[PDB]
Structure formats: C-alpha cells, structure tokens
Design a binder for this molecule. Sequence first.
Ligand SMILES: [Br-]
Length: 246
Amino acid sequence: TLKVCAASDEMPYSNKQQEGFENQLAKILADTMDRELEFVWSDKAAIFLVTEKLLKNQCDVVMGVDKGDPRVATSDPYYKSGYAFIYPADKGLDIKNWQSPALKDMSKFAIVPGSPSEVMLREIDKYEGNFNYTMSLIGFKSRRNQYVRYAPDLLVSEVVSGKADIAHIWAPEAARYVKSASVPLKMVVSEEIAPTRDGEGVRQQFEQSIAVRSDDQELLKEINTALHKADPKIKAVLKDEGIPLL
Ligand SMILES: [Br-]
C-alpha cells in the first residue's frame, strides 16, 4: 500500500472526498507503483502534513512540497509553477511584473502572508496600507479557531467582486477558480526571480516534488521511477486543472 498524508479540507489540492488535484495525482502514483492507495487524513491545513504526519510516521508520502525542502527527501520535480497576478481582463490594465507602474496606483491586494507576495508588497511600499485588508481575509489560530482553513477561492472572489484591485497568488491554488470566475480574469505568472532595491532577488517560481522521510530512500527511488513513467498522466491532470506549467 501507499500511505499518503493528505488534508481533509484544503481545496483545490485535497479534500476527504478526494476531489482535489493532488488526490488525483495520488491515485496515479499508487496505480503506477502497483500499490493500494491509503489516505491518512489530517484535519489541519496542508502546511502541517510534513511535521505532524509524515515526520511522525503516520504516513509515508506528502504529495507536494518545494524541491529540496530540508526537512525531507524530495523526488525529482514533477512540475514547476509560479505566483501570479490576477486581475480583471479587458480593463486595459498593464501588469507584467512587480515593477509595473500600474501596481503603484492600487491599494487593495489579495495576498497570502508569509509568501513572496508579502516580501514584494513591502518592496513596493504597499504592505502597510494593505495590512488591514489582508488580515480581514486570512484566518489565524485562536482559542476559537484551532483548525485554520486556507481558502484561496476567497482571494480570487475578491478580484471578481472588485474589493481587491488585484491578487497575487500561487497559481496552482488559484487556477480552477480563475477559470470558473464569473467575470473574465487575467492570470499573469511572475518572473522567476523578482529584483529588490536593497535586499536580494525574491523567487516567485518553484519546482514541486513528492516528499518522503529522509531515510526512506528505497521508497524515494520507486517514486522517481513511477513519476517518470506516469509523467503524461500527471501533466494531464495538472493541465486540466488550469495550472501554468513552467
Ligand atoms: Br514578477
């Protein structure tokens, strides 16, 4: 069997109903390895899958982490994507990158804190004026909110509604919602490394890999073999989802 650590409520990646794109990928990976797929569901956000499940031996595979994540062994990358600007189409907006003068005329930015989006918002001096807006959207832990859910469809919706001038979101998180949007949206993928005046370049594009525990080297080899074998099916799922592939 292939025991896959997965979030029970983190669309579009995963849910207990197996409707997320990584749930589909897990099925492909298990089939290709001739194993029976067994999900191990977490009630926490997917960002905790590595530390609370995988590294505690509750399951053996995490479907998506950045290549080279120090905490784990990572497979050959099975795709690369990036953070992207998301804004209404047909409004004559010229937005290609973080140096676009258009961004300077905006005030409401739908972003995820702790992401490269935050680093760049500070860089262009819009972070402070956008803080209250961002905090009205993103959930944090409290006594009343022990399981802090991540909903990127909310951020896309803010652009559709016009409450956000623009969003800057990890594209795999946003892609299906940009497609199903009720008004036409543009999704422009950021440059790989965004320049900053004083700091260093801020990476906006990331290779994604399967993760296993660092000592699970034999499993890792089987995974790499399967990934190469199933590559067309894997890429097809990702493309169907609407994910920009770099
Ligand atoms: Br950029």
